[PDB]
Amino acid sequence: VVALERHYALLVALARVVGAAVTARGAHNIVQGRKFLTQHRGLVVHVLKKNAILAQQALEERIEELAEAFMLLITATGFLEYE
Amino acid sequence: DTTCQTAAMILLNALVHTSRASVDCPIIDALNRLNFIGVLVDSLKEILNEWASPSQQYTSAKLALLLQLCQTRQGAKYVLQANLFRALEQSGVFVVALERHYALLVALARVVGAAVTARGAHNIVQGRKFLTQHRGLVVHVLKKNAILAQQALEERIEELAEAFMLLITATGFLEYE
Amino acid sequence: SGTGLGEVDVDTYLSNLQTKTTLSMIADGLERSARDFDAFLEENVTLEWEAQRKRIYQHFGIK
Amino acid sequence: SGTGLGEVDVDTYLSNLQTKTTLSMIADGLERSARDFDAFLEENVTLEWEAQRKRIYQHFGIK
Numbered sequence: 515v516v517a518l519e520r521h522y523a524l525l526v527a528l529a530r531v532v533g534a535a536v537t538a539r540g541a542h543n544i545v546q547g548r549k550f551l552t553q554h555r556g557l558v559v560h561v562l563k564k565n566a567i568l569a570q571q572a573l574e575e576r577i578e579e580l581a582e583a584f585m586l587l588i589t590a591t592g593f594l595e596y597e
Numbered sequence: 598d599t600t601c602q603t604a605a606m607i608l609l610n611a612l613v614h615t616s617r618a619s620v621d622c623p624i625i626d627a628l629n630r631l632n633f634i635g636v637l638v639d640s641l642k643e644i645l646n647e648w649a650s651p652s653q654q655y656t657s658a659k660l661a662l663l664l665q666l667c668q669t670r671q672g673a674k675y676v677l678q679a680n681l682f683r684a685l686e687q688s689g690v691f692v693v694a695l696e697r698h699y700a701l702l703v704a705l706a707r708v709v710g711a712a713v714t715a716r717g718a719h720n721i722v723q724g725r726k727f728l729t730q731h732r733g734l735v736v737h738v739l740k741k742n743a744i745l746a747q748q749a750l751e752e753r754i755e756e757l758a759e760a761f762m763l764l765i766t767a768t769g770f771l772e773y774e
Numbered sequence: 775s776g777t778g779l780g781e782v783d784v785d786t787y788l789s790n791l792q793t794k795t796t797l798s799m800i801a802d803g804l805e806r807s808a809r810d811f812d813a814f815l816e817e818n819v820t821l822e823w824e825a826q827r828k829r830i831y832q833h834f835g836i837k
Numbered sequence: 838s839g840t841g842l843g844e845v846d847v848d849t850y851l852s853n854l855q856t857k858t859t860l861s862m863i864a865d866g867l868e869r870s871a872r873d874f875d876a877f878l879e880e881n882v883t884l885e886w887e888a889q890r891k892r893i894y895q896h897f898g899i900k
Contacts, residue, residue, distance in 0.1 A: 642897075643897060644899065645897065645898035645899020645900065646899060646900070647899075648899050687897055688897055688898055688899075689894040689897045689898035690898050690899065701899075
């Protein structure tokens with residue numbers, strides 16, 4: 515249970531760097547964000563649906579942060595408009 | 598109707614399948630002229646709402662059909678022009694209950710994986726964006742693989758993990774680093 | 775004995791028959807589609823680079 | 838009593854002290870970074886659209 519928690523910790527770190535970068539400059543980086551979600555589609559869907567004893571709470575906490583990380587990139591990149 | 602649309606969707610799979618065995622096909626061409634491929638890709642949106650149950654089995658035949666068109670060389674032309682990358686993004690899709698979840702991701706991954714490696718270097722530009730925009734999620738699957746319900750769930754992980762791997766080597770994401 | 779022992783009626787018997795036929799048809803179609811996809815993948819991957827495609831990633835990504 | 842009872846030596850005592858100090862420093866740094874990131878996210882999300890950002894996806898994607 516502890517090994518998996520460390521795995522998500524790495525994905526969260528990378529997701530935050532990419533998420534904050536796209537929403538930093540503006541419409542000049544949204545073109546890249548859409549490709550990241552489209553090229554890696556499906557993986558994020560599993561995380562956004564999972565969230566929707568000590569080690570268990572720690573693991574679930576990372577899922578909440580990981581799930582909310584991509585959500586920020588979606589609303590910031592405007593992937594909904596692409597459909 | 599719920600059963601007519603299901604049987605009709607599965608029927609088209611047999612027509613295109615047996616036609617290829619007979620590099621082009623007149624059946625797939627007719628579907629494009631009738632605006633069937635167009636409306637079909639449009640229905641891909643909000644797939645999460647649709648997905649034993651009658652609605653579940655119906656979607657299986659739907660995504661299964663699209664996977665067949667992405668195997669022939671001519672399908673990449675008509676399929677790519679439908680702008681399927683933007684259709685699967687609006688839906689936000691990216692022990693037995695979990696198994697069904699991966700089954701949907703595999704179906705979508707196969708359609709996208711086979712489509713990029715069908716035409717050539719004209720679709721690799723889109724594949725890189727899908728992996729970069731959705732990075733991290735695939736990393737969890739590729740690392741997971743590396744009683745009855747358990748084996749069935751793990752089997753989907755192997756197929757899902759190998760699905761993206763084919764797109765990577767076919768798209769050339771390693772060169773981008 | 776007779777006149778009913780864990781049995782059903784004709785109106786329900788025909789419905790159960792139709793449901794079983796439909797379920798069997800759907801299962802056969804799904805299995806055939808899966809087998810065709812597996813054969814296609816085996817034919818496309820048996821060309822070359824069977825283990826390198828995964829070795830490159832295992833070397834690039836975290837093992 | 839004395840002369841040793843589940844005790845250690847000075848050479849190992851100083852090493853354990855240094856290791857504990859290093860681990861505490863690393864833990865404090867990680868906790869401070871996490872707290873700063875959480876505060877930044879709270880400041881950036883408290884502007885508006887707190888629940889809509891997830892509702893749009895719950896309506897688009899499969900619930």
